[PDB]
Symmetry: C5
């Protein structure tokens, strides 16, 4: 017999309900998810350095336990361990929380992975005169629909922002091979520009003599001479007879870039670059 009393309906029928609406002419069953219920594991005061160990709790049964939370109160300091075991014999510690003297201490919800869970409480160097340890468990996952015309109010971790701004990377890089160890004249491979703005082209190899002609393609598909800027001396040219050098191009608006070996003698030539946004 408890202190609560179930109310009666108009015909004298008891129910675990509350009345509502202005005339108290409707009924509703008050409920709590099982995550809101708690079991008291122990209130036995521990000696200095003495431990309480809950018997292994099997998660597997009619209710499939997914998670566990603890509350500890003691008049002296100790440590609450949440532990897990796949064999109910060898235990690993999933969480450990300091329980200060005279301070209600709560764990987080711990999402379980192994088959068995337990609480283990180790008292500190002073004898408790007062101790309670409570355990809650939960289960399952309900589908929910957020109102389509009520946006979720979001913001970003302070680590993902600077001065209230989201940190973004707008620049992308990719390398491209026009020619690798070419030993004769050819256009080689055409770089697809794909929104890139800037291109750095390296010309290098054993070739005693070589000529590289700088080309872009726009809408017609015909090759158009483009000018590059040589890194060492700022020479601007639409071709080179040289090597062990690099050329910078503004390629905004082009569809393709071609570095054509027009002629080559007495060795090989590689033509490779990096395109940037």
């Amino acid at each position: 017999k408890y202190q609560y009393e179930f109310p009666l309906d108009k015909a004298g029928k008891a129910g675990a309900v509350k009345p509502y609406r202005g005339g108290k002419n409707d009924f509703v069953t008050p409920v709590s998810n099982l995550s809101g219920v708690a079991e008291i594991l122990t209130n036995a005061a521990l000696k200095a350095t003495e431990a309480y160990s809950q018997l292994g709790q099997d998660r597997l049964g009619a209710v499939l336990i997914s998670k566990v939370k603890g509350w500890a109160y003691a008049d002296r300091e100790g440590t609450l361990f949440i532990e897990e075991s796949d064999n109910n014999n060898v235990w690993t510690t999933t969480a450990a929380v300091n329980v200060a003297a005279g301070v209600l201490t709560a764990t987080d919800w711990v999402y379980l992975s192994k088959r068995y869970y337990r609480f283990r409480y180790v008292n500190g160097n002073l004898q408790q005169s007062e101790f309670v340890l409570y355990q809650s468990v939960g289960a399952g996952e309900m589908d929910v629909r957020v109102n389509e015309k009520t946006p979720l109010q979001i913001d970003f971790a302070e680590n993902q922002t600077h001065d209230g701004r989201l940190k973004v990377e707008a620049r992308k890089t990719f390398d491209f091979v026009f020619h690798e160890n070419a030993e004769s004249a050819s256009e080689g491979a055409a770089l697809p520009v794909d929104g890139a703005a800037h291109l750095l082209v390296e010309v290098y190899g054993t070739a005693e003599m070589s000529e590289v002609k700088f080309w872009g393609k726009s809408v017609s598909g015909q090759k158009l001479p483009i000018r590059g800027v040589k890194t060492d001396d700022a020479t601007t040219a639409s071709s080179t007879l040289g090597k062990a050098e690099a050329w910078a191009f503004d390629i905004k608006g082009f569809k393709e870039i071609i570095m054509e070996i027009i002629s080559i003698t007495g060795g090989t030539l590689s033509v490779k670059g990096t395109a940037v946004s």
Copy 2:
């Protein structure tokens, strides 16, 4: 079979599946769980080496409309748990597959079902089990919810969508535009809508023996204003050209429209096409 739980009695001696609460334990509440938290044990029969357990097909269609299924397996030896679906309860397709290591509780994800029938199928590995249990949970339905907006929820981007803690973004857009296609007479041709583009590359090409293209933008008044372009081959700056088989780069920031007008043309055709970039 009586369990160790006992329903409490109210003040009038009435049993209920309730717990007391408030300081004086003078109120009651029914503990509940959505059915997604309930599980059925499918089998605990130990399998021989390579032997399979197959659940009979479960019809999703019923008084309770099953939307999703989740499994747990524990075995002292290794095996594989398959979640399968069938529209005819005869031919099975595998929706999910999980390796179950020896002595390790293994869980599937929630699998959202599409076909009419679902089942678990467990294939034991090369060693006979001495201990095996397989649990199945199902869910149904969808609760409409209004999220209390007192504090925003913190969101994050996939590690695949970030680089050095930065969100990867593409700010640049590209579009091609035809000013003139095989024009055989003088006209302004089509006006490019700038729409926040910053840079334009214009190619002039065709059979025309002679042609003049004049470079224009429009700002707020709608009157044509001469603009200057830079020719790709020699870095010539000009507001028009008598040439072809050439391309001209323009800064178009702030313009509403760009026009490449053929002023004159003889002895063939001329195309004028470009690519605008932001």
Copy 3:
């Protein structure tokens, strides 16, 4: 009238309840529940002739349970079409959703959020007689307030249409037009462009005025006017003012608070000064 194979467990005193035991000792109880959205009614399992229709009687949403939404499942050995329909008068129907039901394939509708008073399912069989057919209907109601408690940030995912090569598509550029002067017929500073993070400005000067002088100004922190230089589009002239018209001037305005195009003098008609600022 109706006895199933489920069995209610007993408490320590032998009392049945619609509960499951839990905790290691099975010394606690919990009532398994499902929101009504998870429950279904079978509307029909009567096999239809070729082209024959099933029409559910209009369902009134208004009642002790206020129906907000409806979802359907259909299975048939032959192809057909499932319609979710609505009516304010239970007589004239509009189709809210229609789904093709392939032969031998469980077909689900979306949840349909209802607006009219009455809802129904209508199923029209295709050109082959069914030998097997079931049609299920689920309904829901209400809206629960919730508080979302997260221990980690929520991970977000973008539509494939919102991304390109694993990058979020963004527009960083904004454009706005501004009127400094419209058909001015006398000298004045006119209106001050608020720069507000814009970087580039194009200014057009046009009108009937026979003579005019426009002076180019920016304001920084003090609010004192500072002469600024523009580049004329037609010939790349750089200047801090103009006596001309039917011309446009490009300005780098990074760091300025305001831009002013002052008509210093004007005779023999009117003058407009208008521009576009770009970020």
Copy 4:
């Protein structure tokens, strides 16, 4: 007494449950939050311009009412008012919704603040022959944890985007005081660059003579001369003897910028700027 029938378990016991699983060997209680339940307030047809007024409903009781929603159906047009009162005597309208002839009309959920709520319905200029008015109420707030390992797929409002692209602002602006009404030589305050790329500096005041020297600091902390471009004539210099003028600086890669007054006579000088990203 209704057409539904409670099923029986294997031992013949009735329950407000449904069977589930393949063998129908498990049970579940179908539930609805009370927000899904409705009361019919009235079906009494109104004269032209006649009102229905619900008696004030007290939110305070065993169920604490948080919110209210209405549905109205009538063969003629009218207006549904949701009203609140702190004294159950003076009524303020929180929401008013037009109810068209022959069209089910729903309000939004209205979150209540005063002690009492009611519906008031005012019929239009034509006598009703058919009218029903339904009220739903809610209460409370459930704590929930959203699945931490599953991405939410989100979609941007058309107002958040342009041509399918998310609208972003990459540029930031901040004002900085190097000197305010200085009347003597000093370095003044050092601008922290913090990723800014461009600086506009204004020099102004009564000083008869002044020299301002333009400095940046890199990693060592030593001052390095920098060059600015004067806005009116494009003069490039690392210092100025002038005032009522402004200087533009490229500050990319600098840690700090200093506008040093080297000398000043016969009045005061202010040096202020705007840094941009």
Copy 5:
């Protein structure tokens, strides 16, 4: 009470409502306990008089996580939500002014200590009407949001500017090529990693020194690069000087090297900032 449980077809009472067109299905209306309230008091207080609820232990079969209050009075007062670990010494968690004749609600207060209570202090006028209600909650349901269905987000006001998301696209890092070098070496190679601009400072006691400016692209061979000196806009691929800074366009490079070719009569440092 005025409510009546309906009967099923066999005459069985239940806390249910009928539904579907034929009223041939049943459902149990429920409310989470957070929707339920207890009336603590309706005893009218004298001027300045206080009501104090006895300490409520959160620890029990139902583990109380949170509490919310409503107060109504015909005269003004103050509602305090308080917490205690010992049910003796109280700290105030929340305080809400209650205006005359105005229903006043607290927020949900998420409890930390073992015991909670409401304390109400009446103002300077005797109440003739007063009620005080208390709701509690417990637990936390795991949920899957909008599994098949796209949802909209809205950005924090702090992250937005004229309807645009504020982003920082520019990143900065400092790099040491050389610190107090006393002999010739390449020093450390800056990884460019998408940086576009580099500022390099050269400083120290060295009487004489040469720094050569290098980039590496795809081949891995050093390529001469040109810098612009901050003081006079000199362009060069090397310097014999110090107490100077050089700006480089490094777009497209993989690495940057500031090589000390020679050094006499002291030390030299070479340090920079790379930006995107």
